[PDB]
């Protein structure tokens, strides 16, 4: 089979600039090579195929080029609906294969998240267990760092936390952190807090409640 | 114009056979070709075969002792079979067309459906615990806890609060996954005007509702 290899998993680049997204192949393949865009929804696109052609319908800000084993994808200018990763294919030979892909992601200014935060249900409460959820939502940049503190002391486990992946339209993240106890455990202290580190403010952003 | 759908179960268990099944609309499987590809976790693509305007198919070699590709003409349907299944065949599998004129000799795959996700494993299916999360613009919340497999499908008001939602990847701890999601609205239009979040699993055949009240 053609190994199909993106050396470059991911690319963060601005508004507007030129990018590059670029494929090696095992072998010579006489540039049959298509690219692929698959939204953060799931649905997959042909962008360009045998090399440089564009798919109808494709805007002129995509091009391709290549020979012999190597092939690159070019967007002119970036724009907020290119979020997505891209995937090269091969046609020369069957099987056809694909890279592993490169997920593009848009920079924009950065944003300040909104915090919520919420006691457990009544209705999980019954069943004795005992999530406690602050959402950070709307930031940029997407690193941030979430503690939970209970009666004032940091507590590092029983936390999940998971992000949103870039949104389309505003090139904003959102992330859940949801701290899980025990009833019991729950009912023993009675503040719970939400701390996030950010570079968007030198103080963090604390949430808290009184059980 | 062409439109492609993937259909069938979302778990099925090691040894098993996966069934699948696309059906096309907009177009005719007669002309062009008709192609099953797969994704795994981490990006993974796979091209697995395809079957020819005239009922000719083709298979991966690594998957010829397993996998057929069938058709049903007259109902524009075509088919994947995959024999004795294991969780390395848990996957999101797409159909998709190499009809178009233009490209077809260029061997891009230039329409896709939106794809299914096949789950293999012996686990039983566990629906989703679903809890409300209650406190200028307000945010309410629902978690949706301890369910396998994955997906579940949310939505607000039945849909028609689509935006200002943010539905967080579901996570796998202690074999079942957990996700989250957030709507924010104006202050002035809940708690005065109802906000349900709404919960389907289909694995677990399984669709519940909700609603969000002042505590």
């Known amino acids: 089979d053609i190994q199909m290899t993106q050396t470059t998993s991911s690319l963060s680049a601005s508004l507007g600039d030129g990018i590059t997204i670029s494929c090696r192949a095992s072998?010579?393949?006489?540039?049959?090579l298509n690219w692929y865009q698959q939204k953060p929804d799931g649905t997959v696109k042909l962008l360009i195929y045998?090399?440089?052609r564009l798919h109808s319908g494709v805007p002129s800000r995509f091009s391709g080029s290549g020979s012999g084993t190597d092939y690159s994808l070019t967007i002119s200018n970036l724009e907020q609906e290119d979020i997505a990763t891209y995937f090269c294919?091969?046609?020369?030979?069957?099987?056809?294969?694909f890279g592993g892909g490169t997920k593009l992601e848009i920079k924009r200014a950065d944003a300040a998240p909104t915090v919520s935060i919420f006691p457990p249900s009544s209705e999980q409460l019954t069943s004795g267990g005992a999530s406690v959820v602050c959402f950070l939502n709307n930031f940029y940049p997407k690193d941030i760092n979430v503690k939970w503190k209970i009666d004032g002391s940091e507590r590092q486990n029983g936390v999940l936390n998971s992000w949103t992946d870039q949104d389309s339209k505003d090139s904003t993240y959102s992330m859940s952190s949801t701290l899980t106890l025990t009833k019991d455990e729950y009912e023993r202290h009675n503040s719970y807090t939400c701390e996030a580190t950010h570079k968007t403010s030198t103080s963090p952003i604390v949430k808290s409640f009184n059980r | 114009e062409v439109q492609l759908v993937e259909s069938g179960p979302s778990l099925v268990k090691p040894s098993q056979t996966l069934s699948l099944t696309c059906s096309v609309t907009?177009?005719?499987?007669?002309?062009?070709?008709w192609n099953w590809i797969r994704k795994f976790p981490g990006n993974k693509l796979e091209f697995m075969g395809y079957?020819?305007?005239?009922?000719?198919?083709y298979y991966k070699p690594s998957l010829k002792s397993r996998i057929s590709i069938t058709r049903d003409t007259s109902k524009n349907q075509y088919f994947l079979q995959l024999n004795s299944v294991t969780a390395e065949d848990t996957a999101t599998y797409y159909c998709?067309?190499?009809?178009?004129?233009?490209?077809?000799?260029?061997?891009?795959?230039?329409?896709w459906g939106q794809g299914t996700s096949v789950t293999v494993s012996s686990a039983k299916t566990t629906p989703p615990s679903v809890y409300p999360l209650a406190p200028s613009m307000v945010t309410l919340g629902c978690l949706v806890k301890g369910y396998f497999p994955e997906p579940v499908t949310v939505t607000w008001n039945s849909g028609s609060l689509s935006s200002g939602v943010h539905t967080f990847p579901a996570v796998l701890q202690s074999d079942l996954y957990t996700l989250s999601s957030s709507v924010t609205v104006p202050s002035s239009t809940w708690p005065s005007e109802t906000v349900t979040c709404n919960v389907a699993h289909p694995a677990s055949s399984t669709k519940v509702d909700k609603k969000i009240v002042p505590r």
């Open positions: 072998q010579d393949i006489s540039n049959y």
């Open positions: 907009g177009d005719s499987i007669t002309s062009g070709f």
């Open positions: 294919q091969q046609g020369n030979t069957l099987p056809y294969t």
């Open positions: 045998y090399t440089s």
């Open positions: 079957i020819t305007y005239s009922g000719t198919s």
């Open positions: 998709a067309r190499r009809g178009f004129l233009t490209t077809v000799n260029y061997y891009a795959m230039d329409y």
